[PDB]
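Data card: per-record layout.
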Amino acid sequence: GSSGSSGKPEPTNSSVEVSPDIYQQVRDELKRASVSQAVFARVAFNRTQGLLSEILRKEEDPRTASQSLLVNLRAMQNFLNLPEVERDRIYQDERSGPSSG
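The structure for this 101-residue chain is written out next.
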């Protein structure tokens, strides 16, 4: 009797891969969204800066990195996968406050 429409799929991944340039990626990402390692790290793997900073300083290779770090690395790479449109917003959501100028 008329009416009828549905859809909206669902993702399904498990332990994604990580790139060796994961570091350069983040840095670039930040320089892209012009966000703070904090905001990102927060929307990356729920972390801070002092940490992410060390991850960008030591750049613990994802080949030797420890599960602890890898856990983050994986997360990050998972975030860098998100849609630019999202990341743009995700970041904005974090900042929470445009205040032109």
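Known properties of this structure: The radius of gyration is 17 Å. The chain has one domain: 18-96.

See the next section for split statistics.
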